[PDB]
């Protein structure tokens, strides 16, 4: 791979809780490239998130964690983050950050070829 | 006694078009929805606005100048913002500052903030 | 009421993680003075975790915590601080700082007179 | 290329007083590896001040600092600090970080592969 992304930092928390996930990339790097972040829960597919890309770090948010969850990148460090806020239940999941040789953030899983090794992210009720 | 307290970390010399993370962690009688401000000053200037976050949704603002470089997310648990700087220029050298008050509207005039962190330098090499 | 502290820093960890307390002094201040850390878990009295004291800033540790915990000072904060790292589920309770008018570190919280709120530390595995 | 270090927070202080350092490490960072401190005032190189290492974490001072100076490790930041206490003008210096891939820590700069950008630091009168 081009690329290899290590991820970082999940755990157990209770709702409302914050976690801040890490993706650092390593290889031949292009900050610019879109990162995309994924979840899988039990039973389900992989799930949008968010993503990062383009010269200008635009980000964009699935519905579900839009206002609470942050997505932001350190450009010199090559890695992006995922600051997740009042954290429900429904965001149990194994948390997938995976970038693409593009500017252009996509919802789709398959159009990435580029995958880290996913972190478990567990939300007590 | 102030209800709050500010305390700033991160920040020191980086080469232009680097990268920094600046933190400001806050502890006592701490609203996570209340607006942060961040403001910088250097040498014989006057003190400028950054951006700010602020509001239940985390709302951002920013000045023209930071647009597309600095992100300012918070961290509700740790009672902690970051701003995040990337492609960073001489002209951002400065005393970063990072500021509150009693509402979630972020106001880009450093008056209406009553608390006040340290400072951290930041200094950007030409 | 000569001297007051007023604590900072707890919250949830997960194991294996870290955590800086810190506890700031107000008041008629001597530097030199022993701050104790001390924590209780439910079911248990305050244990010594470590202390810090006379010009020099000695300090010394409960067996369980030497390697893994280091207490500072900072004088002209007025402020000590406790880093914790490797934390563990057996670490989690109520940690408080203490002082009192001597520069020697007791073991004992009876001895002093002078004691912070007090912040929850929890540790999840 | 595998670890960086970013220092922080230097600055002017008046005798008697304090400042804490900082240096952060990224990339492929081992927390037990040896993290030293070293200081240059107007060109005379890198006299050692301190240094810390181990799994249990244990620290080493120079003869002109020790008590007045602290150093502590956050691994899960795997930021290091220096915490500069009674300073006085003699400390006028930069201060600089380093790290080597391996738990003993040296006196001598030439066996850190790895350099922090160096702080100022100025004490007056
Ligand atoms: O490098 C990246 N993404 C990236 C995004 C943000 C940061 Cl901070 C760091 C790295 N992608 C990339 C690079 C090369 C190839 Cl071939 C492909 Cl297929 C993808
Ligand atoms: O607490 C805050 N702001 C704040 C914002 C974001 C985070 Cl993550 C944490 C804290 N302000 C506050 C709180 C009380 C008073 Cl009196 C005043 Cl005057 C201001
Ligand atoms: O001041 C202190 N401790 C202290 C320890 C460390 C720092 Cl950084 C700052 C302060 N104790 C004190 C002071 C006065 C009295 Cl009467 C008593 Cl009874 C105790
Ligand atoms: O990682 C480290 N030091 C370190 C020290 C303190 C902390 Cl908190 C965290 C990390 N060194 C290292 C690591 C890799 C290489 Cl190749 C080399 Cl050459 C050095």
């Known amino acids: 791979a081009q690329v290899q992304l290590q991820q970082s930092g999940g755990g157990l928390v209770q709702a409302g809780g914050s976690l801040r996930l890490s993706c650092a990339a390593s290889?031949?790097?292009?900050?610019?490239?879109?990162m995309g972040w994924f979840r899988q829960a039990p039973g389900k597919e992989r799930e949008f998130v968010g993503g990062?890309?383009?010269?200008?770090?635009?980000?964009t948010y699935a519905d579900s964690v839009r206002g609470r969850f942050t997505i932001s990148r350190d450009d010199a460090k090559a890695t992006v983050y995922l600051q997740m806020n009042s954290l429900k239940p429904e965001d149990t999941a194994v948390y997938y950050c995976?970038?693409?040789?593009?500017?252009?953030?996509?919802?789709?899983?398959?159009?990435?070829?580029?995958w880290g090794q996913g972190t478990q992210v567990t939300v007590s009720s | 006694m102030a209800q709050v307290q500010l305390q700033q970390s991160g920040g020191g010399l980086v080469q232009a078009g680097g990268s920094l993370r600046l933190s400001c962690?806050?502890?006592?009688?701490?609203?996570?929805?209340?607006?942060?401000?961040?403001f910088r000053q250097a040498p014989g200037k006057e003190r400028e606005f950054?951006?700010?976050?602020?509001?239940?949704?985390?709302?951002?603002?920013?000045?023209d100048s930071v647009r597309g470089r600095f992100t300012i997310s918070r961290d509700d648990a740790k009672a902690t913002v970051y701003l995040q700087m990337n492609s960073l220029k001489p002209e951002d050298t400065a005393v970063?500052?990072?500021?509150?008050?009693?509402?979630?509207?972020?106001?880009?005039?450093?008056?209406?903030?009553?608390?006040?962190?340290?400072g951290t330098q930041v200094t950007v090499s030409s | 009421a000569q001297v007051q502290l007023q604590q900072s820093g707890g919250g949830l960890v997960q194991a294996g993680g870290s955590l800086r307390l810190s506890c700031?002094?107000?008041?008629?201040?001597?530097?030199?003075?022993?701050?104790?850390?001390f924590r209780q878990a439910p079911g248990k009295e305050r244990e010594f975790?470590?202390?810090?004291?006379?010009?020099?800033?000695?300090?010394?540790?409960?067996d369980s915590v030497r390697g893994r915990f280091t207490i500072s000072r900072d004088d002209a904060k007025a402020t000590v601080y406790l880093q914790m790292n490797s934390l563990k589920p057996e670490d989690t309770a109520v940690?408080?700082?203490?002082?009192?008018?001597?520069?020697?570190?007791?073991?004992?919280?009876?001895?002093?007179?002078?004691?912070?709120?007090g912040t929850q530390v929890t540790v999840s595995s | 290329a595998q670890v960086q270090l970013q220092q922080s927070g230097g600055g002017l202080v008046q005798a008697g007083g304090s400042l804490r350092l900082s240096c952060?490490?990224?990339?492929?960072?081992?927390?037990?590896?040896?993290?030293?401190?070293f200081r240059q005032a107007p060109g005379k190189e890198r006299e050692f001040?301190?240094?810390?290492?181990?799994?249990?974490?244990?620290?080493?001072?120079?003869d002109s600092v020790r008590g007045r100076f602290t150093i502590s490790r956050d691994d899960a930041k795997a930021t290091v600090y220096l915490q500069m206490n009674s300073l006085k003008p003699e400390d006028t210096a930069v201060?600089?970080?380093?790290?080597?891939?391996?738990?003993?820590?040296?006196?001598?700069?030439?066996?850190?592969?790895?350099?922090?950008?160096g702080t100022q630091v100025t004490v007056s009168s």
């Open positions: 995976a970038t693409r040789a593009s500017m252009a953030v996509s919802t789709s899983p398959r159009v990435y070829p580029i």
């Open positions: 290889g031949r790097t292009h900050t610019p490239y879109a």
């Open positions: 990062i890309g383009g010269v200008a770090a635009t980000t």
